[PDB]
């Protein structure tokens, strides 16, 4: 997953 974990 290229998104940052919020």
């Amino acid at each position, epitope marked *: 997953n*290229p*998104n*940052a974990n919020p």
Partner: antibody, heavy 122, light 105 residues
Framework: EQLVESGGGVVQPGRSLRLSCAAA?????????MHWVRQAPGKGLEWVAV????????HFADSVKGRFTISRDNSKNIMYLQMNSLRAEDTAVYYC???????????????WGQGTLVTVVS | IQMTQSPSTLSASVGDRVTITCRAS??????LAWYQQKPGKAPKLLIY???SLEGVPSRFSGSGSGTEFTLTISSLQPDDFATYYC????????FGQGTKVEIKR
């Protein structure tokens, strides 16, 4: 939130082009992976590349692997796509996109830009 | 992972119910997105993970799992003349070829 691509133009085969994609400051650029999707003027969409949120990882389609490099400067809120070894296949409109709805896997691009045209002719 | 859409072109009258099928080479579980692209602008996202909508007309619908997915329009409006793409995001990101939806007047 808005994405604006820049840097497209007309060049010869083998020349290089450095595309940019600037995000409006209302957009958390640091939060999401940034993608590149291109569309040849006739055919449909082809995914091209992605850089992770922090720039720690990146992926390329086998179509462009070994010729394209990708980077992002989170502070400047800009992602760059360095295109080298350009060929006729690379003539397309280049959108930068982002999937800003986090799950275990992400990839539903809700945000796009108008795209930059890149024409490779001699 | 390769994607395939059926059909490639489709004609239908205003008010008809149309269906678009997407097929995956290997089994993408539920990570699929449907896009609408009218020729003038960038694509607009319609539904994600196969069924969840956020394509705000309630007339759109998504189904499927494994390798067979379907997008349907409840009632065709003339604003929906566009090419529709499916896209998986299980193993990286790959698109389908697209489906042109012509209107019959």
């Amino acid at each position: 939130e808005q994405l604006v691509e820049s840097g497209g133009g007309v060049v010869q085969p083998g020349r290089s082009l450095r595309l940019s994609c600037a995000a409006a400051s209302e957009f958390c650029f640091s939060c999401y992976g940034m993608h590149w999707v291109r569309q040849a003027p006739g055919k449909g969409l082809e995914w091209v590349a992605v850089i992770w949120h922090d720039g720690s990882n990146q992926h390329f389609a086998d179509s462009v692997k070994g010729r394209f490099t990708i980077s992002r400067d989170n502070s400047k809120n800009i992602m760059y796509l360095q295109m080298n070894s350009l060929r006729a296949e690379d003539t397309a409109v280049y959108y930068c996109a982002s999937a800003t709805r986090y799950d275990i896997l992400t990839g539903a691009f809700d945000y796009w830009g108008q795209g930059t045209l890149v024409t490779v002719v001699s | 992972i390769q994607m395939t859409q059926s059909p490639s072109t489709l004609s239908a009258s205003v008010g008809d119910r149309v269906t678009i099928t997407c097929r995956a080479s290997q089994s993408i579980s539920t990570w699929l997105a449907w896009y609408q692209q009218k020729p003038g602008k960038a694509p607009k996202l319609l539904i994600y993970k196969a069924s969840s909508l956020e394509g705000v007309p309630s007339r759109f619908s998504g189904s499927g799992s494994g390798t067979e997915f379907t997008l349907t329009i409840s009632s065709l409006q003339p604003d929906d003349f566009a090419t529709y793409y499916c896209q998986q995001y299980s193993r990286y990101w790959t698109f389908g070829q697209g489906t042109k939806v012509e209107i019959k007047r």
